[PDB]
Design a binder for this molecule. Sequence first.
Ligand SMILES: CCCCCCCCCCCCO[C@@H]1O[C@H](CO)[C@@H](O[C@H]2O[C@H](CO)[C@@H](O)[C@H](O)[C@H]2O)[C@H](O)[C@H]1O
Ligand SMILES: CCCCCCCCCCCCO[C@@H]1O[C@H](CO)[C@@H](O[C@H]2O[C@H](CO)[C@@H](O)[C@H](O)[C@H]2O)[C@H](O)[C@H]1O
Ligand SMILES: CCCCCCCCCCCCO[C@@H]1O[C@H](CO)[C@@H](O[C@H]2O[C@H](CO)[C@@H](O)[C@H](O)[C@H]2O)[C@H](O)[C@H]1O
Ligand SMILES: CCCCCCCCCCCCO[C@@H]1O[C@H](CO)[C@@H](O[C@H]2O[C@H](CO)[C@@H](O)[C@H](O)[C@H]2O)[C@H](O)[C@H]1O
Lengths: 62, 459, 51, 98, 170, 606, 126
Amino acid sequence: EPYPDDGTGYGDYPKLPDRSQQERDPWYDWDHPDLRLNWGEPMHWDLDMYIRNRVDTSPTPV
Amino acid sequence: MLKYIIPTIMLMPLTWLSKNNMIWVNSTAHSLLISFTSLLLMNQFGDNSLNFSLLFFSDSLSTPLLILTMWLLPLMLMASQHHLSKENLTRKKLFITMLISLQLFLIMTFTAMELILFYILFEATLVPTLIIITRWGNQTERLNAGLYFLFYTLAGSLPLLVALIYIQNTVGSLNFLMLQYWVQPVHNSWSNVFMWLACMMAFMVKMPLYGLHLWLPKAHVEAPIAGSMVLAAVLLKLGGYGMLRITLILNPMTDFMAYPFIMLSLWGMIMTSSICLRQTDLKSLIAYSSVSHMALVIVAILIQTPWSYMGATALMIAHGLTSSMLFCLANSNYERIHSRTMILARGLQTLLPLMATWWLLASLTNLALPPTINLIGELFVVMSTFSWSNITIILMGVNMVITALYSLYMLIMTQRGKYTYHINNISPSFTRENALMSLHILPLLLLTLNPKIILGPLY
Amino acid sequence: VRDHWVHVLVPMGFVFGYYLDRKNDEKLTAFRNKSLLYKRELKPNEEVTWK
Amino acid sequence: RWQEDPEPEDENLYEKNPDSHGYDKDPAVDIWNMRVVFFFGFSIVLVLGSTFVAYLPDYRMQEWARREAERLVKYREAHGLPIMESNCFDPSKIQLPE
Amino acid sequence: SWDKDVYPEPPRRTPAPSPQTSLPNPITYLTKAFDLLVDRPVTLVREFIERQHAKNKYYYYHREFRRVPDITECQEKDVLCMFEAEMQWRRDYKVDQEIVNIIQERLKACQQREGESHRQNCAKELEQFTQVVKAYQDRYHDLGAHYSARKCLAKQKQRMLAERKAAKEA
Amino acid sequence: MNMFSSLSLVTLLLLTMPIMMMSFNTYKPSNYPLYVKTAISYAFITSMIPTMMFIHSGQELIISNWHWLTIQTLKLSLSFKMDYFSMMFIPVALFVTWSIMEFSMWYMYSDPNINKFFKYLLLFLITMLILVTANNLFQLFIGWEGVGIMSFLLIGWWYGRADANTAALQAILYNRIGDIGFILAMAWFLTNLNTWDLQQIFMLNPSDSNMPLIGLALAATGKSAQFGLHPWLPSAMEGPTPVSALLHSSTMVVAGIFLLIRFYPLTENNKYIQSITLCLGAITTLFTAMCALTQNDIKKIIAFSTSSQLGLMMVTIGINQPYLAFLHICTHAFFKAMLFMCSGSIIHSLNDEQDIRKMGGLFKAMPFTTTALIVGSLALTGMPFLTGFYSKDLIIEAANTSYTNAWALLMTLIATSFTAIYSTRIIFFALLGQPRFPTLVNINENNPLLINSIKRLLIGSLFAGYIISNNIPPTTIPQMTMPYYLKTTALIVTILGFILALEISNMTKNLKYHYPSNAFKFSTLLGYFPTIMHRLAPYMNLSMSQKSASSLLDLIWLEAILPKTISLAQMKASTLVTNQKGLIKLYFLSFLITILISMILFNFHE
Amino acid sequence: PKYEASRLSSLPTTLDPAEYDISSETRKAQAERLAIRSRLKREYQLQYYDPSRRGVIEDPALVRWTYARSANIYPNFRPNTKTSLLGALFGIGPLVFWYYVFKTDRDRKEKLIQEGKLDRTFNISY
Ligand SMILES: CCCCCCCCCCCCO[C@@H]1O[C@H](CO)[C@@H](O[C@H]2O[C@H](CO)[C@@H](O)[C@H](O)[C@H]2O)[C@H](O)[C@H]1O
Ligand SMILES: CCCCCCCCCCCCO[C@@H]1O[C@H](CO)[C@@H](O[C@H]2O[C@H](CO)[C@@H](O)[C@H](O)[C@H]2O)[C@H](O)[C@H]1O
Ligand SMILES: CCCCCCCCCCCCO[C@@H]1O[C@H](CO)[C@@H](O[C@H]2O[C@H](CO)[C@@H](O)[C@H](O)[C@H]2O)[C@H](O)[C@H]1O
Ligand SMILES: CCCCCCCCCCCCO[C@@H]1O[C@H](CO)[C@@H](O[C@H]2O[C@H](CO)[C@@H](O)[C@H](O)[C@H]2O)[C@H](O)[C@H]1O
């Protein structure tokens, strides 16, 4: 699903869920364990904002 | 200045008449000797500048820029000789010749007494710089980067030519010593508004001012390492040096004409600093860092106070060494992984321990840790803009926070964390690379022990 | 030596440049010992105050 | 498509020369390149240059100014004169308009 | 070593030791040890160095600048006279910076020396600092980075014109 | 004077020698940590000599030894203030660092980069001493930022761990926000007083000191983790335990308080600044003590204990008792450093377990760590005549009998009760009851480095407050007349805190299962401040960077309005000029139109 | 008390009602996702484990990401009511805002100095 066609300039780049990498399964054998990414999988447009050092979107108990 | 112009010229017959395998050894050795003799320009007086002849003079502003310029040439030869190893001999010598000719123009540019002579040499530096980027840049987009670089400069510099010739007709001279005494105040009028813009825009484009900066991230991402070093270290400072001189003859109109450019710089530095937090290409990140640091210099020059002029000079020298270091550090990673993507190779402190120390030291100077001259320059500007208007401290303070965040973000992302599993060619740091890093940081940190020599005429 | 003769080019460029800078001074002596600040009388063996 | 050479493989200088300084493939040239950089860069420019800067003769007359200020403060206070006057220039030499 | 009139100091008043205890003063014995272990060897080395210096006595001088006409006596655009007037003004400006520094140094030393009584005992130094700063501000403040004798003279005349105007209407 | 000044400088130079020896001159890497530890212990001895001279006669002096730089009328010299505050702090810092460094020789024994670790601890200490002895603001700023950067390198010691890198950057972020206040004060003092030297600032003594002092208050907020810029301090537990011990006692965190103490000549005349610091300290001490009530990580409980104790120091500044605030800094350094050292002893014995829910039954298994932990807890809670009593109790009486914000006073007393509760929580869950740790028992506190280092701080935690209080010269008129209920309030609320804490602790043993309240969740999750602020603010800033600053502006509209549109116009214009049919007829027809227009329209024939 | 998701706090997977209502059409999609992931995993591992390889395994996904985040924007940019209003709102607006903040502050300060009501008693550094 691409980003909506306005003037923004996303092109055909996929729109992926706005979720932090911290939410990914930490026990799975990621090709990039620190990023929790697999080689060849599409990267979220804002991946650099969703690294584990930055913005977390994990469920909260409250 | 002939004692520096002639030996600089002699570097070209030396390179072309050297043995095939000794072009790097010979050009590096003798350009270091030239750099050594450049310390004689420190004969500066409290009242008068060092006026050599009718063509060339040196003062406390041009002297530090001259020494930085001549120091960078051997560093550029060190940085370039590896990625040029496959290049055939004649083209290697042509590359070195372009670097030498760039230095010759630069040392004449910074010491030219007459402003039209300064203009011609100021323009001449474009030619070799454009050749270095377009001929020896690596990617397809170097051709576009060459065009943007060329036409951004000329769009501003041609109006400067008309203004300069106009001033000489009206005043009778463009000699900078003459203008110091025959300067007359600039009265309000629409003619003088455009004379002011013609006198300033060319230097703004080179700094670069926010809004006219889009050519610079392009130029860096496409230039070879030596191109990036000279671009960041010296070529940006042609604008600052030009502004510091020409503002003499623009008073008191600068009082109100500077407002739009102070707003662009003050807001520009926060935007470009924020942009650095999201850059994915390491060279592009360093390029945007330069725009933010030079936005401080524009503000300092435009508010014209002794503290701001001293801070502007120190910042120009300090940024020259720091940004040149950062490009060299990023290039040394590129020569291994052949990608500028910051997130590609991580955890390099585990694999290259000593290179991570250079990364730490460069980052600390970039965020202006006291008592580095990076901090001295930034602090002096912050002090002077506070008097100009107390509210500027909020913008200055926010930029300091963002600057620390992106400087340490760059250090953390590339050096810390876990190493990338499949990147298995991270060979140990070469002696050449380690020496190149230390030849940046060591003079930079030594200057902290005697900062007065980089504080400029207002000291 | 044919091996190391290129190493004199830049050092000789500095000596020639230094010499020409001094020649430049001989053309700018219109005020030597004539400025209000420094003008004085010559010492018995002095021909000029500076060169 | 056309007749073009393949991309060469990047060569690790350490394979042929484990002692490489990273300057040149020729070990003799490599060592000389290291020596000029280290000698002219560090031994000369940085050490002697730092020493030269440390002993610059009163750069921009700061030390002379302090000595001169002491001389004036001494003489002015001895004679009951103001240490410093608001007027940089003598008013008797100035003709105001109107 | 320095002129006591330029950098004044009150006569130091030290109380004599007046012990009211049978315990020995550890500072007294450390002072003796320091004098014996540190000061005496240091003094011997210095006296050797001073003997070598006395064998090679030579002198240096404080440069004297003759006065030249100031910017008020220069014809418009006469660069030769303007240059000499301008350089003299720049030298005086540097001297006036150091005079303010001397007065600030006096003020800072008084504050530390007088301790908790500094607010009362440093009035004369504070008054002198206030006056020189006012005089310095009148001369040089607001001239900008591209300052000159011309701009300094223009500022003074603006101040003179204001002073005359007020005096007339009085 | 010659011995006083010579020995005070030799202390600082002594600490730099192990750093200089890293140039491989005369180095013995075999035992660099011992060499560094020995230098600290010898520096402590040399610093006691000038400290003794000050206590005898009040000898104080300033050493402006090196002229660095003159900027017109601003002369910057390397100047050292050897005064009351630097004379008493330096021996305390060196004594505590001596124990921490000796302890680290055991705690960090298996760390491959132990040599680098001890170098960073030494650099940490040097930048703090620069901070404490600085006589001008530029020199102070060098130490100010130095400790911050050393905090970054030591918090992120285990740099392969993302959480460590995040915590390290978080300390930088919050401290740089406080640093905005620091540069504001520097700018104000230069512009208005023409100085960065403490002497001239105090002599000129401005009455319009709101702006510079708010800047200093902001700087202290960041550095001492007061409310608003507080979360970074509990996050700094990412670092090795010796980092926390040094960070929380003799160095980083007390710097903010020390900055305000150094400027008491200005704050004591500014009631507006006093009210702000009083209320900032009160909310901090109350809020962080409340957070400690429900923490399970032992290092985090003690971290929140520091924030609460720092808030109390900030309250002492608020009620215009700078010398009492300084005394608490000195006493707090002993038992707080011990508490971290004792917790490190427990963590090591339980194979890096830091959850108190997995401790228990250690009262007899680790008798010496138990003794030190009990003594440290009693000193923290103000047990009479232990080191903490000689500062806190005087602070509570001074606050009780002062003209002060009534709410701030109540918040401070409640926080004193909460101190008893969370100290009880550590003792109850860590030492009493039955073991809850794994089955392979590896408990062992019998290393002389561990025992001796804790032993020295135990002795300090008993007598240091008594020794210091009986030697410092009076600088205030202590308030000693008050009603019985204002004199004993600190003791009573502390005792009630202990009793109430025992009711709560014992109720956890009943076979009853309880649902959580909102208050419990609010305390456990730290008031949601990190959850909301550390997600929202980074999201908003990082989103602005890419979406609007980078893409919208720098890759689009600044491109559009100039180079992109200009190129189009020329390309369109070129196609108009060159798209000709090559016909003789059409070209000569245009010649006719040109000649006609030249005359009829422009009169070129005239 | 139901879970309320937010942008910065996602709905827990165990509380997602779509997590349990799983159809054969949804299992078919999950199988196809695991086939793409497995196909890419194999392609990666064949290079990652190759003993003769030395260098970087170029990842097209990473290249596409860095390309999209820069060079691909302007070609797919359209001047319209959205980007123009966002372009104006955050491009010119802050400059005008700060211009008035600083201009107003400096006019007030300059008027006080000329009237002699700004205290500059010790102000000789600027
Ligand atoms: C009167 C006007 C004319 C003035 C002429 C003055 C200079 C005349 C120089 C004549 C000799 C030139 O020498 C000729 O060029 C170069 C440099 O030597 C040599 O060839 C060169 O190859 C490479 C560089 O390319 C190097 O190894 C080395 O510089 C040299 O061997 C030729 O082998 C030689 O034949
Ligand atoms: C305000 C002072 C400075 C103003 C300077 C403005 C003058 C013009 C500078 C750039 C000149 C480059 O000249 C020409 O520009 C266009 C884009 O602009 C480039 O074209 C590039 O952008 C266009 C438009 O997105 C694309 O269709 C094209 O694929 C791409 O290569 C041309 O390849 C280049 O030949
Ligand atoms: C003030 C000017 C200072 C300029 C400093 C310039 C430094 C230049 C360093 C030159 C490095 C030495 O250059 C090299 O040295 C050796 C010995 O002399 C020469 O001679 C060599 O030839 C062969 C090697 O093939 C062997 O006999 C032996 O290794 C050596 O004699 C080389 O032919 C020369 O290429
Ligand atoms: C401040 C005054 C500055 C004056 C500077 C004058 C600079 C003139 C530069 C040359 C102008 C023509 O340059 C030419 O422009 C057009 C349009 O952008 C470019 O055309 C390119 O961009 C357009 C725009 O999408 C595409 O449709 C086209 O397919 C592509 O080729 C050419 O590749 C370029 O060669």
